[PDB]
Write a protein that binds this ligand. Structure first.
Ligand SMILES: *[C@@H]1O[C@H](CO)[C@@H](O)[C@H](O)[C@H]1NC(C)=O
Ligand SMILES: *[C@@H]1O[C@H](CO)[C@@H](O)[C@H](O)[C@H]1NC(C)=O
Ligand SMILES: [Cu+]
Length: 481
């Protein structure tokens, strides 16, 4: 039992960026101002397409954003499940999609950023603000840190949050794709890709302080990281290279353990993965395993060379990797992967290099992990069902009563609804939840962690896993301020 690939789909745009839409769980994908190519200046618009998980069908490409070419942006989901995309080819702009108004309805404008930028990272802070830093694909000026207040609809520079301490030594865009992880009291850990990690404080006029080196790791551009147990403060990191392009990626794997902001982050070095990867994606699953898919060995853009076609499942409880079933198409630069509400995992994309470019990959597939199958690894297991939640918009600390269709012993986790492009996914985090049996083996009460630095505001998927480890299809709910 190594899981199983689902059937292949082929979008009418190259799915370079993708987002899970709250409530439905549909998968929204976008490229740029063209379906199949990009430019630095962009086309003043974006093509998007949407996979519907209720029907299994894909809709044809539309120009859904008519003011902003959202190639190479920052992405974050805010406290209400709005997808906020910054910069990129239209390097000054902020756009927003509110799913409630229609998954295919026009993206609408928000305030321009103070500093124009592209290939920055964006994250939603414990206050529900949006912090960006870096990003020199486009724009101008030192790409210092700024913060978006979505109540005020303003962007403010944070003099105390310079980019300098995160910049790597070599290669293109050394200030870009920071591994940003929101934490307690408005803090953000930049965990990489520079071997030097740094705390940022997004309150006030800003502050920053070293968080320590990432053990013995080297600079790791377009390595991956994921916060697989926010309650324990754990982040898994893998791979990357000394520069954006030009060098061999690594199979280095670490676990970071966060304590208090401004303190030193603990780093443990694991056994290496079997495959070295740059431009991979990492996805945390409801059981706390991490799936690492794609990437290449010697890093170049728009290239299918030295592809790693065999993904790996990492289990933090064993500190070990296991290979899963190979795919046939490379998933290198501009590839994406994302957890779906049915606990399968999207993988696809790659390329975006013009008409008749053989490195364009419009396609992808959904990977069903081992937990969806019986011990023979081929028969689909029966799945539990959440009938209801007591509440769907709860505060930090607040209880939620979860009513299962069938009586039994269940475990729970909530995974933050997320989006990804260019290896960057700041939105994804897992919180394991202790469930209190309510008497009947059917109603269970959990509490949201009491800290908004752990339970970052916004939408989550609540999964219940039965005694076999088989997860249900998630319910959505939000954590409010
Ligand atoms: C897609 O749409 C068709 C009708 O065009 C519908 O019959 C079908 O059930 C939907 N899903 C799949 C997976 O074909
Ligand atoms: C939050 O951070 C600020 C620094 O901006 C600090 O003044 C305060 O001590 C922190 N609050 C808590 C509850 O730790
Ligand atoms: Cu790119």
């Amino acid at each position: 039992n190594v899981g199983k690939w689902g059937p292949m789909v082929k979008f009418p745009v190259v799915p370079v960026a993708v987002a899970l839409v709250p409530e439905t769980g549909n998968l929204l994908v976008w490229s740029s101002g063209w379906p199949n190519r990009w430019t630095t200046a962009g086309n003043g618009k974006t093509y998007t397409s949407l996979y519907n998980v209720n029907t299994g069908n894909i809709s044809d490409a539309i120009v859904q954003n008519t003011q902003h070419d959202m190639f190479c942006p920052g992405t974050s989901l805010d406290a209400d499940g709005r997808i906020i995309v910054t910069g990129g080819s239209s390097a000054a702009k902020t756009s927003v999609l509110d799913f409630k108004k229609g998954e295919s309805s026009p993206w609408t404008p928000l305030s321009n950023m103070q500093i124009s930028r592209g290939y920055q990272s964006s994250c939603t802070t414990s206050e529900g603000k949006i912090f960006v830093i870096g990003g020199s694909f486009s724009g101008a000026g030192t790409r210092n840190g700024e913060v978006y207040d979505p109540k005020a609809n303003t962007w403010t520079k944070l003099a105390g949050c310079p980019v300098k301490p995160l910049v790597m030594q070599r290669g293109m865009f050394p200030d870009s794709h920071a591994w940003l992880w929101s934490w307690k009291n408005g803090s953000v850990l930049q965990a990489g890709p520079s071997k030097k990690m740094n705390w940022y404080d997004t309150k006030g006029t800003g502050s920053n302080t070293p968080a320590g080196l990432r053990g013995t790791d080297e600079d790791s551009m377009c390595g991956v990281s994921v916060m697989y147990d926010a309650v324990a403060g754990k982040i898994f990191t893998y791979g990357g290279g000394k520069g954006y392009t030009g060098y061999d990626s690594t199979s280095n794997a670490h676990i970071l353990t966060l304590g208090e902001p401004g303190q030193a982050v603990q780093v443990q070095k694991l056994a290496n993965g079997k495959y070295n990867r740059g431009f991979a994606n990492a996805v945390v699953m409801p059981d706390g395993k991490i799936w690492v898919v794609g990437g290449m060995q010697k890093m170049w853009l728009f290239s299918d060379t030295t592809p790693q076609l065999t993904p790996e499942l990492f289990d933090p409880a064993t500190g070990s990797f296991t290979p899963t079933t190979p795919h046939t198409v490379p998933r290198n630069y501009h590839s994406t992967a994302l957890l779906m509400a049915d606990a399968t995992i999207w993988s696809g994309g790659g390329g975006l290099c013009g008409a008749n470019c053989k490195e364009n990959h419009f396609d992808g597939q959904f990977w069903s992990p081992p937990y969806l199958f019986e011990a023979d690894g081929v028969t689909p297991a029966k799945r539990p069902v959440i009938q209801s939640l007591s509440d769907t918009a709860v505060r930090a600390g607040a209880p939620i009563t979860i009513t299962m269709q069938d009586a039994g012993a269940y475990t729970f986790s909530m995974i933050r609804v997320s989006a990804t492009t260019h290896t960057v996914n700041t939105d994804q985090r897992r919180i394991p939840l202790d469930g209190q049996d309510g008497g009947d083996g059917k109603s269970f009460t959990v509490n949201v962690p009491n800290d908004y630095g752990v339970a970052i505001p916004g939408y989550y998927m609540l999964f219940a896993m039965n005694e076999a480890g088989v997860p249900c299809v998630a319910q959505f709910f939000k954590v409010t301020l």
